[PDB]
Design an enzyme around this catalytic site. Structure first.
Site, short mmCIF file in Angstrom:
data_model
loop_
_atom_site.label_atom_id
_atom_site.label_comp_id
_atom_site.label_asym_id
_atom_site.label_seq_id
_atom_site.Cartn_x
_atom_site.Cartn_y
_atom_site.Cartn_z
N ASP A 105 -10.79 2.77 -3.69
CA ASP A 105 -11.27 1.42 -3.26
C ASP A 105 -12.70 1.16 -3.75
OD1 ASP A 105 -8.66 1.57 -2.26
OD2 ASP A 105 -9.48 1.93 -0.12
N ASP A 121 0.71 -1.30 0.10
CA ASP A 121 0.13 0.07 0.15
C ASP A 121 0.84 1.14 -0.09
OD1 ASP A 121 -2.29 1.47 0.00
OD2 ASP A 121 -3.00 0.50 1.66
O1 LIG Z 1 -5.56 -0.11 5.04
C1 LIG Z 1 -6.09 -1.01 3.82
C2 LIG Z 1 -6.59 -0.17 2.82
N1 LIG Z 1 -5.46 0.45 2.05
C3 LIG Z 1 -5.90 0.35 0.64
C4 LIG Z 1 -6.12 1.65 0.26
O2 LIG Z 1 -6.32 1.74 -1.18
C5 LIG Z 1 -7.36 -0.44 0.59
O3 LIG Z 1 -7.29 -1.27 -0.94
C6 LIG Z 1 -6.96 -1.37 1.89
O4 LIG Z 1 -5.75 -2.23 1.75
#
Ligand SMILES: OC[C@H]1N[C@H](CO)[C@@H](O)[C@H]1O
Ligand SMILES: *[C@@H]1O[C@H](CO)[C@@H](O[C@@H]2O[C@H](CO)[C@@H](O[C@@H]3O[C@H](CO)[C@@H](O)[C@H](O[C@H]4O[C@H](CO)[C@@H](O)[C@H](O)[C@@H]4O)[C@@H]3O)[C@H](O)[C@H]2NC(C)=O)[C@H](O)[C@H]1NC(C)=O
Ligand SMILES: *[C@@H]1O[C@H](CO)[C@@H](O[C@@H]2O[C@H](CO)[C@@H](O[C@@H]3O[C@H](CO)[C@@H](O)[C@H](O[C@H]4O[C@H](CO)[C@@H](O)[C@H](O)[C@@H]4O)[C@@H]3O)[C@H](O)[C@H]2NC(C)=O)[C@H](O)[C@H]1NC(C)=O
Ligand SMILES: *[C@@H]1O[C@H](CO)[C@@H](O[C@@H]2O[C@H](CO)[C@@H](O)[C@H](O)[C@H]2NC(C)=O)[C@H](O)[C@H]1NC(C)=O
Ligand SMILES: *[C@@H]1O[C@H](CO)[C@@H](O)[C@H](O)[C@H]1NC(C)=O
Ligand SMILES: *[C@@H]1O[C@H](CO)[C@@H](O)[C@H](O)[C@H]1NC(C)=O
Ligand SMILES: OC[C@H]1N[C@H](CO)[C@@H](O)[C@H]1O
Lengths: 390, 392
Positions: free
Chosen positions: B200, B139
């Site tokens: 997301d 991430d």
């Molecule tokens: O904290 C987890 C979140 N971080 C990404 C941001 O896009 C999401 O897909 C999920 O993984």
């Protein structure tokens, strides 16, 4: 409207949301607005248990009319799509033990562009009565003044009364007033059996949310006027169609029961899933919607992407709906003190709580000191009935 | 990424959308992020046919870590929720014939606020490799400098390579670039097996529409970069949850097949309807998604609240998806000249057309001059397979 009708919210079927203004009977004979479509829905309303459940009014919406009036200045059904005419269709619907609703417009044209009723209110009312019509939905398009709007709705209401036939009068007066001035709901209720408040529903969860949010926002103004003879109309049930998940369908059924809304299905009774049919025919939920007391429920609480609504019922019972408005994640836990429900009276000294939606389950006895805890699905609703132990 | 992995879009299960960062194991034991949840999910992936269908990677998302690193400066699993540790979880997952994915962040902290990997890229890569991790989702939170984002992603890629273990590398680099400048996808593909492009997903038809509309709008930039070893990631499958009607679920399955997307389910395999399972395990649609040619599809047509997408497949076949975006009324008729599909190649001289979604039914032989006629449900999709043929 004190015409002895709609003592509980009107229940039935209306073609608009699912079938709209489909005039292509050549290429789509099975879905076009025609006498055959309505005969098919009537037959299925009888054979598939809809009438038994309480759905009684089979209603035509816009696009049944001929392009122009006849030599006598009276409205006529389309000669090709309604060859036997509305009176004959009404005869058939009545022979099934059902009632027929039809559509008209207060202005110069209907919303789809067919003959309006401005200038013909008395002729049109007497025509409907002669046809044996049992309900009228009266739209507000093509009306150039608030004064003409008001005058037209009141005038049609009185003309219907003068025919001597019992006719449910469904108005869109508030919806067309609202952009310009605040409606006087005491007056509307004087003239109407139920009234559309907000924009047309479509086959989407967005539409449901916006209807709930609007009713929520204006509840101070609209909740108390509703009661036997006059209901707020948040528009059609779209359970059984394409755009709502199972939990969104449950939310619509539960909240239309809480809101003492008219229950007008707009779907295809020829092609409907067993789940959707069982939800629309849910006896306990319809009983809530049809509660003879007729007190509209309201939003009690809102916060943390949760909503709590409740409705007082006959005989010291209450309905409570809990909505999870978070559209991510899983079933989310919600707890509330039962003493906060039903104005503090529902569970004093105790109450028996039955969950009705999404599944029927007895939850047991709750003391006045108890907390009720539930897990609510994203975009779903838990519907409960509370019976005071007396 | 030229590591020999993800020659077809990766298939598996990721907890984020359905389970998020639930740490309340006392009050919400069935939905908190814990080793037991993943062990149970692994068992159900085996017993309920998910592995047989191709879903191979059981992936942990954010909120598995302890609040800080150990004395050796290595990341550690949460003691209460993962008492037996990541290696034993990986051993279990491997013993069921599955592969384990884990999560980390390029910046100083994860999006949920747990230890970031900046400063420990090599240590963290080796930690994952020692644990038996088979996939890393990386991430981009808490990294407000473009140079750090880019260098960190490239660095973690090289550090994973240096471990010598085969690890699928799933990046969020492009998504986190957008606030500052447009990504260079040629460079990202150099370092990543697949890359998140857009915001997301959540459990809603609005979310799906917005992912599709962004992909359509940007397809000039991203479609041609996709291929064996590097894929566009439009985020998780949410079929089986609560927010999508059946037709919207069909639309997501069909279009994730068209897009050559990684197929990461995010649902509860313990509570899933037979319908949703049959859709997610649909062998013909999975075969489209996994087509060895590996060329991403695209939006061919748009108008009158209709969309037409198509994807070229191996051996002169095509997949065609027709979406009805009108959210009122009933099934709408759509007709198209069969010659306009598949660059005119699909049905030259003829094609045999099989409808796959919403139901499987053979439609027959269509000559190059024919018209294809279909009826599409509101918010639904008709998915067709065109097989080139010289036969009638
Ligand atoms: O904290 C987890 C979140 N971080 C990404 C941001 O896009 C999401 O897909 C999920 O993984
Ligand atoms: C045209 O408008 C007039 C005036 O608005 C309207 O007359 C009203 O009719 C209603 C219903 O027909 C009357 O309400 C009834 O009043 C009688 C009084 O004798 C009651 O007995 C009735 O009780 C009913 O409900 C009871 C429980 O509440 C039950 O025991 C039973 O089911 C009864 O039927 C009911 O309250 C109202 O009084 C009149 N008002 C006037 C001024 O006449 C008329 O109906 C309209 N005509 C058309 C065709 O719409
Ligand atoms: C660390 O990085 C290096 C490169 O940076 C990486 O090695 C590279 O990727 C693969 C390793 O599998 C090599 O690709 C193979 O090359 C040979 C050349 O003859 C081909 O025969 C192979 O083809 C088969 O597999 C392909 C699938 O990738 C199919 O396309 C094909 O049809 C065959 O089935 C394959 O192309 C590549 O040559 C190296 N490049 C180098 C070494 O420069 C290494 O794997 C990384 N290590 C880890 C642990 O990730
Ligand atoms: C809303 O309309 C109602 C009815 O048209 C009004 O109530 C009437 O008011 C008159 C005096 O103007 C009284 O003689 C009647 O008894 C009332 N009827 C009822 C049923 O109460 C009301 O005043 C209007 N409200 C506003 C704010 O204009
Ligand atoms: C209908 O049209 C006439 C003439 O154009 C106009 O005078 C009248 O006010 C209109 N009626 C309404 C309700 O708008
Ligand atoms: C993108 O990155 C690659 C790899 O470094 C490079 O070859 C290419 O020139 C870059 N593209 C642009 C437009 O800078
Ligand atoms: O033309 C008919 C349409 N006009 C109304 C506007 O609210 C809809 O409900 C439907 O009746």
């Amino acid at each position: 409207l004190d015409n002895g009708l709609a003592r509980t919210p009107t229940m039935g079927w209306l073609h608009w949301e699912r079938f709209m203004c489909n005039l292509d009977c050549q290429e789509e004979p099975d879905s076009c607005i025609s006498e055959k479509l309505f005969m098919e829905m009537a037959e299925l309303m009888v054979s598939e248990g809809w009438k038994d459940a309480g759905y009684e009014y089979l209603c035509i919406d816009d696009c049944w009319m001929a392009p122009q009036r006849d030599s006598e200045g009276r409205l006529q059904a389309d000669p090709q799509r309604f060859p036997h005419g509305i009176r004959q269709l009404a005869n058939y619907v009545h022979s099934k033990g059902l009632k027929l609703g039809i559509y008209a417009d207060v202005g110069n044209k209907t919303c789809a562009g067919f003959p309006g009723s401005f200038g013909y209110y008395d002729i049109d009312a007497q025509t409907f009565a002669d046809w044996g019509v049992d309900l009228l939905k009266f739209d507000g398009c093509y009306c150039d003044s608030l004064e003409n709007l008001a005058d037209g709705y009141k005038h049609m209401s009185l003309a219907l009364n003068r025919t001597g036939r019992s006719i449910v009068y469904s108005c869109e007066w508030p919806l067309y007033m609202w952009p310009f001035q605040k409606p006087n709901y005491t007056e509307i209720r004087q003239y109407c059996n139920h009234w559309r408040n907000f924009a047309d529903i479509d086959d989407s969860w967005k539409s449901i949310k916006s209807i709930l949010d609007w009713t929520s926002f204006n509840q101070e103004r609209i909740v108390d006027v509703a009661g036997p003879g006059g209901w707020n109309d948040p528009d059609m049930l779209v359970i059984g169609n394409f755009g709502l998940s199972w939990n969104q369908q449950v939310t619509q059924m539960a909240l239309w029961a809480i809101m003492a809304a008219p229950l007008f299905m707009s779907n295809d009774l020829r092609h409907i899933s067993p789940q959707a049919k069982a939800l629309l025919q849910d006896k306990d939920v319809i009983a809530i919607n049809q509660d003879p007391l007729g007190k509209q429920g309201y939003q009690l609480r809102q916060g943390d992407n949760f909503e709590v609504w409740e409705r007082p019922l006959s005989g010291l019972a209450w309905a409570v709906a809990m909505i999870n408005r978070q559209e991510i994640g899983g079933p989310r836990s919600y707890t509330i003190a039962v003493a906060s429900l039903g104005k503090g009276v529902a569970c004093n000294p105790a109450c028996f709580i039955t969950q009705l939606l999404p599944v029927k389950r007895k939850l047991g006895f709750y003391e006045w000191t108890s907390r009720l805890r539930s897990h609510i699905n994203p975009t779903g609703t838990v519907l409960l009935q509370l019976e005071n132990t007396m």
